[PDB]
Design a protein around this nucleic acid. Structure first.
Ligand SMILES: *OP(=O)(O)OP(=O)(O)OC[C@H]1O[C@@H](n2c[n+](C)c3c(=O)[nH]c(N)nc32)[C@H](O)[C@@H]1O
Ligand SMILES: *OP(=O)(O)OP(=O)(O)OC[C@H]1O[C@@H](n2c[n+](C)c3c(=O)[nH]c(N)nc32)[C@H](O)[C@@H]1O
Ligand SMILES: Nc1ncnc2c1ncn2[C@@H]1O[C@H](CSCC[C@H](N)C(=O)O)[C@@H](O)[C@H]1O
Ligand SMILES: Nc1ncnc2c1ncn2[C@@H]1O[C@H](CSCC[C@H](N)C(=O)O)[C@@H](O)[C@H]1O
Ligand SMILES: [Mg+2]
Ligand SMILES: [Mg+2]
Ligand SMILES: [Zn+2]
Ligand SMILES: [Zn+2]
Ligand SMILES: [Zn+2]
Ligand SMILES: [Zn+2]
Lengths: 126, 293, 293, 126
RNA sequence: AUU
RNA sequence: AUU
């Protein structure tokens, strides 16, 4: 079978694809592969989701669509804004978590003030 | 120094020959290059192609129109489209297309045979990576191929703005004589081989600054024979050095002037500006493109 | 992945042969590599040497003692010493030396023939880049060379601490049978060719963890013949990929234990600790070295 | 003649070698060459003179001794402290000035508070 | 051709 | 060998 077909089908079948993927991961499943990592200078702002690659020395920049569970499963997005935040942009993933960018974008949230990943660059609270 | 360039362009000395078509026999054929860790083959390839395009006189207008055929892949994603979107100025309309469904960062994604793509709009840049899988099948003679190439030759002639550019992927067996002839309708042209895939007969026929009329007469069969001869006699070592400095990668937005075509208004000043990447001639309304069959 | 390594080590398969000495005929002999802009050949070469040393079990004590022969150059500076100073832990005593005057970043610089260098102290690391210019002169047969090699063979046997290491530069014609034979007095050894100078017969004979006694019996003449055979039959492409990531370049200071030698105290546990880079055996007083003649 | 022989001899001959070199430069002389540039990550603190290369993205790191006029001329140093600040260390030179590191270290001064080149990284005053 |  |  082609790569990722099983997990993408399993998630697309569920009513809550995010929960389906998180449960798949908690049972030891291999994370979704073939997220598109870009070449960049790694001297960027480090913000979470940007129009061009903005990885700093501790991040990797990926094509946004390839890191979106709903994009990858070809299912409708539940985003309250009515559109995807990732498709057409670039997502910065901490290098330690770059083995599962889809899981990272699912499990984390962007600070609406500074634009950094909450818990991975945002220091507004402290 | 050649290993530090994004790739190698066909010298004019080899364009001017009149060779017979030979079988392509690359010294390093099939060899794989080691890329930066975790980088896809096509991210590297498209990055080198864009690095080379950076050295040409591409027109870069406000509200640029770029279309990318063959953007899908067996992985279900579109690395080439991601590289193009990184490269092109912000706000550039990027439309991609492929026979099979895929996920993309383009503004619109058109699924279906490229012949089902319809639009009234003209485009500023045409990138094609299309390749017919049945090309791999053994054949008696290496003849000019039709299929999508046919469509492509129509598109360039009908939907490419004057001053626009193209990069069309070809190989030893995936080629078309009329596309080579159309290359002579540009201010400049070449066959460009990326350094990361120099072990392949793949090249990109690059036409820079479309003129809409034959500036150079080109025999496509002879020219593909010339390309094969050049590849056979000039081996290229796999190299990914140019991928280590991305500081100058984004396409420089020069705000190229855009104007509408009038009846027989192409005076020599217009040809000059077109050939220097200083003018795009087309209408500039909202783009409407579809592959609905 | 060979192009991404700092260089290539002589396979064990080739050390165990019994070849006769032949002429070295490298396919790419003399070819020049393009380095990062403004980087000297010796900065690249010494950086790759240190990158390879990073993969071995070098003892790294507090107050390390490193000596570097052949550190001068026709430019009047010492790029190799600058690389060593970047690589070695802060506070490491770095002493370099050369026949001709030069400016260096070492703690002490000793000018004169290496045979004029005197010291009571033992050393933890010996780097030698020495090369006799007259080696270039045409000769009838490629015989074992004396000169500085003689001195070097004495130094290793008299002034190298147990557990210490060496890297001695040799070429097709700049070699010494006794140095090869001494390579068998270390826990591990190899001949290492940097990727940036793979078009040369130059290599670094690396001895890792000195044992003070013959662990492996080596015929120096036969082993140099084996090295030449390996170089002749295994061409290496020039490569500087490993130079693009310096994030893990500094030698890891692991605080290797230092102890003084006593009469017949070399039990097998001590050999175990010596062979893993876990022990340096020498006194640890202030170093006093000079080349005053 | 070997490279730099003329200028190094001319500077070593004068009582004030710094003035001799600055006059040589002001008359159009070619700057001293073969300052030893190091490979580094360019993610360093950017300080002027450090024990290891500390270039940032706008600097290059050189072996300190090769960038010292007095070291290069084999003449005595006039440093009031009695020793050379450059020999044995690494000097960060702004990339725009990396064509003449000896001239740069001659013409400029290090902030004793923050350790940056005054006018090329020091922001203590502003 | 999607190394 | 100091490309
Ligand atoms: O991607 P390619 O470089 O293989 O070009 P292609 O797909 O158009 O060629 C199809 C078939 O030709 C055979 N073959 C092609 N080329 C260029 C070579 C070559 O250089 N050396 C050898 N030994 N065979 C070649 C392949 O079977 C290829 O599938
Ligand atoms: O630095 P080198 O690699 O030249 O080694 P060397 O100085 O010890 O050799 C001295 C002379 O030998 C001749 N020669 C050496 N090597 C290794 C080659 C070779 O590989 N291919 C040819 N055609 N000649 C070689 C040189 O004259 C060299 O100066
Ligand atoms: N007539 C046609 N119409 C549309 N797509 C076609 C086509 N003939 C071939 N193709 C497409 O050409 C593609 C070649 S694979 C291209 C890989 C892609 N450029 C990347 O970025 O990875 C295939 O996806 C195939 O479906
Ligand atoms: N017997 C000897 N004693 C001391 N130095 C010697 C020597 N024979 C040769 N040399 C020195 O060996 C050096 C080889 S050139 C070495 C270049 C140096 N590693 C660099 O970093 O650039 C020459 O400078 C030469 O003077
Ligand atoms: Mg290939
Ligand atoms: Mg060389
Ligand atoms: Zn999405
Ligand atoms: Zn915040
Ligand atoms: Zn000095
Ligand atoms: Zn300051």
């Amino acid at each position: 079978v082609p790569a990722n077909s099983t997990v993408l089908s399993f998630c697309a079948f569920a009513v809550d694809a995010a929960k389906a993927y998180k449960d798949y991961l908690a049972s030891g499943g291999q994370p979704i592969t073939n997220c598109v990592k870009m070449l960049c200078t790694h001297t960027g702002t480090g913000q979470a989701i940007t129009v061009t690659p903005e990885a700093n020395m501790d991040q990797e920049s990926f094509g946004g669509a390839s890191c979106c569970l709903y994009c990858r499963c070809h299912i409708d997005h539940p985003n309250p804004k009515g559109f995807c935040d990732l498709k057409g942009k670039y997502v910065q993933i901490p290098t330690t978590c770059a083995n599962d960018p889809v899981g990272f974008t699912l499990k984390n949230t962007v600070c609406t003030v500074c634009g950094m990943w909450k818990g991975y660059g945002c220091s507004c609270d402290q | 120094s050649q290993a530090w360039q994004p790739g190698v362009a066909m010298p004019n000395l080899y364009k001017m020959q009149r060779m017979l078509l030979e079988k392509c026999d690359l010294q390093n054929y099939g060899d794989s290059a080691t890329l930066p860790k975790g980088i896809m083959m096509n991210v590297a390839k498209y990055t080198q192609l864009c690095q080379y395009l950076n050295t040409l006189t591409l027109a870069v207008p406000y509200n640029m129109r770029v279309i990318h055929f063959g953007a899908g892949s067996d992985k279900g994603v579109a690395p080439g489209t991601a590289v193009l979107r990184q490269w092109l100025p912000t706000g550039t309309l990027l439309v991609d297309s492929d026979l099979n469904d895929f996920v993309s960062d383009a503004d619109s994604t058109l699924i279906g045979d490229c012949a089902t793509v319809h639009t009234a709009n003209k485009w500023d840049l045409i990138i094609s990576d299309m390749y017919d899988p049945k090309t791999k099948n053994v054949t008696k003679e290496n003849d000019s191929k039709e299929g999508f190439f046919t469509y492509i030759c129509g598109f360039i002639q009908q939907k490419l703005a004057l001053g626009g550019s193209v990069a069309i992927k070809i190989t030893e067996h995936s080629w078309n004589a009329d596309l080579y002839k159309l290359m002579g309708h540009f201010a400049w042209w070449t066959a460009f081989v990326t350094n990361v895939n120099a072990s392949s007969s793949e090249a990109f026929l690059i036409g820079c600054n479309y003129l809409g009329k034959p500036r150079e007469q080109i025999d496509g069969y002879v020219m593909h024979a010339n390309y094969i001869f050049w590849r056979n006699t000039n081996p290229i070592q796999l190299s990914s050095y140019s991928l280590f400095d991305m500081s100058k990668f984004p396409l420089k937005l020069r705000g190229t002037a855009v104007m509408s075509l009038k009846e027989g208004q192409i005076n020599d000043m217009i040809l000059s500006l077109l050939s220097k990447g200083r003018l795009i001639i087309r209408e500039n309304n909202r783009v409407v493109i579809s592959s609905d069959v």
